[PDB]
Amino acid sequence: YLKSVLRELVTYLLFLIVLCILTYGMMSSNVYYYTRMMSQLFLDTPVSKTEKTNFKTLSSMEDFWKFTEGSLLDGLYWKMEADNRSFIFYENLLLGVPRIRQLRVRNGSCSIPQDLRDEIKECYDVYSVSSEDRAPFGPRNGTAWIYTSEKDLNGSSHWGIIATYSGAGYYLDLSRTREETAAQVASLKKNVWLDRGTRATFIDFSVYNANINLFCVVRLLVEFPATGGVIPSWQFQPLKLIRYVTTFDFFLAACEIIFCFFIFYYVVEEILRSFWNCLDVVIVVLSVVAIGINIYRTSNVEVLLQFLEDQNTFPNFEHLAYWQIQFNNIAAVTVFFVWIKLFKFINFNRTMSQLSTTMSRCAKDLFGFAIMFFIIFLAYAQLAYLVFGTQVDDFSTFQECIFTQFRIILGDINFAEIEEANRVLGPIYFTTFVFFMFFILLNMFLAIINDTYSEVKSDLAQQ
Amino acid sequence: YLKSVLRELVTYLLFLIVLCILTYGMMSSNVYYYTRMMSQLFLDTPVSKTEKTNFKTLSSMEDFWKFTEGSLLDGLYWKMEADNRSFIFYENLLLGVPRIRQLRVRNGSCSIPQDLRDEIKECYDVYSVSSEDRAPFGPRNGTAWIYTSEKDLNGSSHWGIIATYSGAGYYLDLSRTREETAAQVASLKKNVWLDRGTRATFIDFSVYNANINLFCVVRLLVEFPATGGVIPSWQFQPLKLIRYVTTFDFFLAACEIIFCFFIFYYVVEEILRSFWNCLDVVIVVLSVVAIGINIYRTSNVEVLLQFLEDQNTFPNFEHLAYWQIQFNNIAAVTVFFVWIKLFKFINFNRTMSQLSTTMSRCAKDLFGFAIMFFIIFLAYAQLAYLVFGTQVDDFSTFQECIFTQFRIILGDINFAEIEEANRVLGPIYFTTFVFFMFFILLNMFLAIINDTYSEVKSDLAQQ
Amino acid sequence: YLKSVLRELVTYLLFLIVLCILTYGMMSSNVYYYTRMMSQLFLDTPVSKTEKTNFKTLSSMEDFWKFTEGSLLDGLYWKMEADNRSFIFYENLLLGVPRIRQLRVRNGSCSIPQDLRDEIKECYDVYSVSSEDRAPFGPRNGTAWIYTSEKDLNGSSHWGIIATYSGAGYYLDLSRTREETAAQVASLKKNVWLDRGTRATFIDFSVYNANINLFCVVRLLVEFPATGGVIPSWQFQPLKLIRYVTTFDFFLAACEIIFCFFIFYYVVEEILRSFWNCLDVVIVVLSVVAIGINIYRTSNVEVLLQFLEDQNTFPNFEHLAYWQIQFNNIAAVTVFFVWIKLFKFINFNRTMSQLSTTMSRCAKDLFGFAIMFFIIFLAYAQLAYLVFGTQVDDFSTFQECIFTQFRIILGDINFAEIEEANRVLGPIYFTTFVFFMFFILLNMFLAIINDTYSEVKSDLAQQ
Amino acid sequence: YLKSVLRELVTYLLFLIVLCILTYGMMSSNVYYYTRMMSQLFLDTPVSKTEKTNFKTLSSMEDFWKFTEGSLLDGLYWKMEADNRSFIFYENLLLGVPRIRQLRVRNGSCSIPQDLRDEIKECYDVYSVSSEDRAPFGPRNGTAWIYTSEKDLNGSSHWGIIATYSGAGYYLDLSRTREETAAQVASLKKNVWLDRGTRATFIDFSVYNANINLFCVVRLLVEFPATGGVIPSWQFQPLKLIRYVTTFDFFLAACEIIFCFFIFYYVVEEILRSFWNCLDVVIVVLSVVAIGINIYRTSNVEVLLQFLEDQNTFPNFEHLAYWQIQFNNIAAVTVFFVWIKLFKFINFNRTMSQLSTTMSRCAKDLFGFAIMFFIIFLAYAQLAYLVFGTQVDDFSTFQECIFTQFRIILGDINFAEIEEANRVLGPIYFTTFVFFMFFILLNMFLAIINDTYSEVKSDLAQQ
């Protein structure tokens, strides 16, 4: 019997090191510095030589135009040998052409109160699919001034910080050289292409590095709330599109075939309470979804093929970059659970079995109290969100009030801005929360664990 | 019997989701960014193009005048279509006219020691109602140079950081356009309108956004301590004055009528130790006070009606903004306690009843020790306030010494400035406090909880 | 018997509120802002309009001269009505005249290794009383270039960050007006008054505010390590020299007489193990030392009397400012222990007596373990000081390694600079320390407390 | 018997204070400020008067050349008396001559995917020993353009942040005076000496201070990842090369002879489970390795002798600086364990023996759980490294994911950049980690300790 348990064990071990290789394989080492250099080049540099603002700092439309005609262009273009081709840092192709796209809301989307109608002529509602503006505003001379559908314009919905944004909109494709684009952008500034109705503008381009082999897909997102102002956000996503270059790449591709066999085998075994059963299900479920993504989605690479035909176009990678994120996310979570499955095999020792039986017994009591706990925890969260949240960034949304309260328990705090927001409840909230939660309530978990642990040591000693 | 308990339960649940809607309803989602853009526009921008100071940074009267003639004016005025009307960010009316007001203390308010009378001619005491200056200083040509009572000048006492300030004072109303105000402020600077005797100056104006429907009331407060210098502070308060625009607004107004019924019903039930009784009282008390505020106070909106008649005046919203703060505060605290009332219904399960009976028993022991605890805790607070508090900001006041000690327990610390203040007690205070409080004393709570918990598990197991 | 215990109790209570008044009385409320404005005026302002350095930032002698001829002069002088008198912020007399003093080390104080004697001509040792330079360097035209003894130059030893400094040295007194001093300082710069041999320079002046009644004594200390460079440090100390102005000042002076009676009475009672006895001794000891300081030291005020005779001199307050620090320190520590003496009276309740008997029993076990603990704790401290401490500021000295380890336990950390210092032990130190100390060892206290607590609840229940 | 235990005790005590002296002796007090001034002079100063970047901030090759021709030269040269000799801060010889060295990778080191070969002409692989470029690029006019082997160029492999770097490379030695070097560096800039193929450049020089007697060896390392950009790093290492100057130096040298005797004696005693035996072994092992380093390695000082002959050369100290690091590291770790050996002697008291027997019993249970713990801990680490690590600095490498998770437990967090990286898993990771690890799992240690402690108090009381 112990042999059969060890029989399935060695099976499991290989499944680890197979999976251990893919992750280490599918992720190059220093990639962090590849994004870091991109980000610092765009995000972190002064919008203009005389200006102190970053891209992260943009407060206004005026700042935005200074960015486009500013550090952005000077970030995208380098000379340097085509010379129509520009190597960022000299190591990185700007791949194809950048694209700017905006989203726009209709005039009468909202309604002015009858009292002020004599005062205010027109309003523009918060962005929504219903309120979107499809009208051909402006000179109507091209794709910049004419709406194009999300189908006709290949693209997908992007999820921003205040809203989700459709792929459709008013877009313009830039040019290969700095001189040509600077003309276009100037024209988009001369004519007013950012108006009261613009909610969001996207700037997307892709970069290819040949030293290591990686694409980098960039999305610079700028939102224009109905309240005025600017909310910048960005995404820098590396990709591995060309999977066969080095022999080591072929080495990995072998495993992805081998790794496919195991899952097929675990599906076989899984055919037929318990916790460890619920574990195996979760692994197999995610393991399939990972492969499903890896094949009929991320292995298509139809875009690259089209792009390499004509290199003057916009290389739309937004989807490919999207799925590999979803892939990496899922792949990681599998790996995590796969490690936890190892505890099933640690019961060899007395002391280990001594512990496992305790935590198994810990569960029913703790879970019962966690409910009691989070009801109180979420009460504060909802309280903090009503008192703060029009003031403090950390409390801005109900999601982030929850996260902030974890940071408080750990000691990450900005107390000053809490007290500035409300000089009465700010202190009361903080004090009472820190008191009841951190002093009394956290200790109530640890009370449960001691009892249930010492109890299990009591009776097992009786045996 | 269990049906009756469940009978009152479903009653309670509806009362939640009713109340859950109002809060979510009465608070728009992204409002945070509406204040954030206002604040960054005024607080966060350099006082002048050549100057590095914010409004938050003001160190002197000279800096203050640079702010008024500086970023303030350039923040309030935009061109842009009336053109007498100015849209901040282009989305936000500057509503009516700004108003500047100062407070002033009499000459002989204080007394010079007889030894130095030959040296120093005149002193000016710390601001107080007694020492306030009602004399018509200066050219005496208008409301700027003539005192006006808090009654005659509609307004209320504001509570600042070093003092409470009456609504009365010397005020001047600005103009609609940047050119006219810049003349006025220049005249207030030419003639000396900020002198030895000025303790505080207020800058108040209101802003209306039509996209979302919200007013924003702004108070820029600047204090001039008797010690010289400047202490800036600010308040940005959104308001919802016009309550019927969208159908969803009508949807909410229905609930506020429905919600009024429940409280009337709970008042009926409450007519006749125990803890849960003390809970219901607290809810009903606050729930009434909330409605009282909501009706005969915040539902008056007499000011708006007067303002819309003549739009060249100062739209005094200070009160309306005040009460909605008090309203939101009270509303939040009710919601908080309403959630806690849910524990009364969690006793269905064994394990829950297992826990409830423990924490009920935890109380008498913990409270007994908390007294023992805070006596020690407050001892340090008073110690730290005497040693520090002339040096370190965090210890500046006895209130904030208490808060600082919570931040220390959690790990939020600036130790450097503590050691700079006193190089001997600074370390001794910090060491001993962290030692006795965090090591020994916190653990004394958790000692109590373990005992009382394991005891309750002992005897209930006997049954 | 319970009456006698209550008889001594009410005696004790009055002693609190008497002492509670003096502290609140002897410390004005907003004084923090009085120093804060002084500090920001001097410390925090750019050394020159074109320079970005503060006084806190000084890296070099060149920076120092830029400070003296820079923000310092522009900080000390204001116009403004004598006009020979200058009111800082317009509220604050510059009192008398500033004074600059330096300390200097002899040439041959150190010894050059025989190998390099052909290379290096001369060395200057670290500052010490033995190596001090009394020679009249330079043009020898005045007190700036001639040594004056600590006796002949009224003054005391000051304790700096790298060394203790005698009051003696080479000093120069500045002038009343900005124009005259700027000439002097220029001459001290033209002629080289800061040379290889200068270890430290002091800048001392006093400021009087008449609105509130307080002096402010300032010491700007700049050290010049033997390694080259600059280490700035500062002290801003308020004082209350004139004790009778307001009636409330007379009100306090009454208590200081009353408060003297109590201590005389407690000395009577104390004439004749136990812990509470050891408490009363400590209070009475400190309470005497406080009064001793308060009378024959701080109540002398002979300097002020001399100063007010001739106001063109340097008002040496360094001692008076020193003692009131020592006074405030001692006064605070008494107050702290006085509160703790209150626990002697909390034994009325069962639960309180229930707790007191536990912590009394906790002592012998905890203290035994604390020894075991700090041996390990200090081991790391000594380890961290050897590995780091040539690199990381926080570990610079063995004293501060101890403090840093407390900050680590609480979560205040700069990990980056630890890893930069040593990329191997840095992580190992941090990991192992956080592991053994925070996981295992802290929990060993709490293990002791639970046992000894639950034990005391066990047997007392048997009674 | 107790005498013999005390007999070995006093032996041990002397061994402490002997060792206590050496450490305090071998480490001068204020050395921290000696490096701090060096670092701030080079690292912390603006690359140019018009530029805001430090050396720490370098983002590009262009920035690098601005640094060399910039603050570096102005940092190395001072006038000041030879005058060919330059005293940094006037206290510090620039010793000999600086040296710049770069490392270079071959053209075809990597391979371009066949699809893009028409596009991209050439690639340069990540630095490795295999891909290193030994070809004489450029004008081939000197050691700057010609490869020199690590043997022929005295030097050792340096371990950088992304790679290990051989001592070999293309180097150039600068000149004694600022004017001459500025010509050389200009020529290295005119001709392109930093190209696509440069992975890393080193700048090494040594500084001698005669006031205190210390050398300071400096390494300024700049890496050029294959992804483009710059990654600066630095090392400032003090040294004591000349060991006999002061009598106190002779005093220490006596102990190093005495200290050699003890280890010889403990080797004698150690000749022949238990834990304390395993302790003594570790001490003796390290104690030997320390002396081995101290004699046939660090006591050679052959370089200094050669250097003092001809002072126009490059004084290569890289090795000497290296070993004293290794020496200080080992010396510290010995001292640490030596303190812990003191617990062997604390068993005199009951309470101490009461504790020792507990922690001895704590071990087997805790260690069993630590395994269970770190499996979970490392699971998160591997998870966080896959999700983050292309984004967040703190997660950049798997090593640092581990360290980051310790900082999270303590409360050191940057949550913002976690949420920006991944807006879904970022919160989930952080929440679940903080929940399971900090709430449940940490408390599982403390559960073990309570049980095993109270158990030992149970049975010992029975005796």
Ligand SMILES: *[C@@H]1O[C@H](CO)[C@@H](O)[C@H](O)[C@H]1NC(C)=O
């Ligand atoms: C928006 O609609 C209102 C409603 O009539 C109209 O008065 C205004 O001119 C419109 N503005 C634009 C830019 O279409």
Ligand SMILES: *[C@@H]1O[C@H](CO)[C@@H](O)[C@H](O)[C@H]1NC(C)=O
């Ligand atoms: C549309 O008309 C404007 C007005 O002159 C012109 O500047 C612009 O170039 C035109 N658009 C295109 C695509 O030619």
Ligand SMILES: *[C@@H]1O[C@H](CO)[C@@H](O)[C@H](O)[C@H]1NC(C)=O
């Ligand atoms: C979408 O993809 C199709 C596929 O060839 C292409 O023809 C079309 O131009 C794309 N749409 C764009 C680039 O807007």
Ligand SMILES: *[C@@H]1O[C@H](CO)[C@@H](O)[C@H](O)[C@H]1NC(C)=O
């Ligand atoms: C303030 O009062 C004193 C008291 O006589 C007087 O000398 C001084 O001129 C007064 N100053 C002002 C501005 O009124």
Ligand SMILES: *[C@@H]1O[C@H](CO)[C@@H](O)[C@H](O)[C@H]1NC(C)=O
């Ligand atoms: C008061 O007199 C001054 C002095 O000329 C003048 O500048 C100011 O305008 C006058 N005030 C008013 C309200 O006209």
Ligand SMILES: *[C@@H]1O[C@H](CO)[C@@H](O)[C@H](O)[C@H]1NC(C)=O
């Ligand atoms: C106060 O309110 C009354 C009400 O109409 C108004 O007449 C008066 O002008 C207000 N006071 C001001 C604006 O100072």
Ligand SMILES: *[C@@H]1O[C@H](CO)[C@@H](O)[C@H](O)[C@H]1NC(C)=O
């Ligand atoms: C310091 O002493 C040395 C020893 O002779 C001498 O050569 C040097 O000139 C002296 N320098 C000064 C400034 O006194």
Ligand SMILES: *[C@@H]1O[C@H](CO)[C@@H](O)[C@H](O)[C@H]1NC(C)=O
């Ligand atoms: C000492 O001599 C120098 C040299 O001219 C002179 O500038 C300085 O003023 C003299 N000192 C005094 C106190 O006059």
Ligand SMILES: *[C@@H]1O[C@H](CO)[C@@H](O)[C@H](O)[C@H]1NC(C)=O
């Ligand atoms: C020290 O105090 C005495 C007392 O009058 C005074 O005469 C002397 O000038 C003082 N020394 C100074 C100011 O250096």
Ligand SMILES: *[C@@H]1O[C@H](CO)[C@@H](O)[C@H](O)[C@H]1NC(C)=O
């Ligand atoms: C690098 O190698 C490729 C391969 O042929 C060649 O085309 C290119 O010119 C080479 N570049 C340099 C700088 O040697």
Ligand SMILES: *[C@@H]1O[C@H](CO)[C@@H](O)[C@H](O)[C@H]1NC(C)=O
């Ligand atoms: C190599 O040739 C270049 C080209 O003129 C010249 O500038 C450089 O000085 C030469 N190298 C040496 C070491 O002379």
Ligand SMILES: *[C@@H]1O[C@H](CO)[C@@H](O)[C@H](O)[C@H]1NC(C)=O
């Ligand atoms: C290495 O050391 C030898 C020993 O004398 C020396 O001759 C040679 O020049 C050194 N190599 C250098 C400095 O590159």
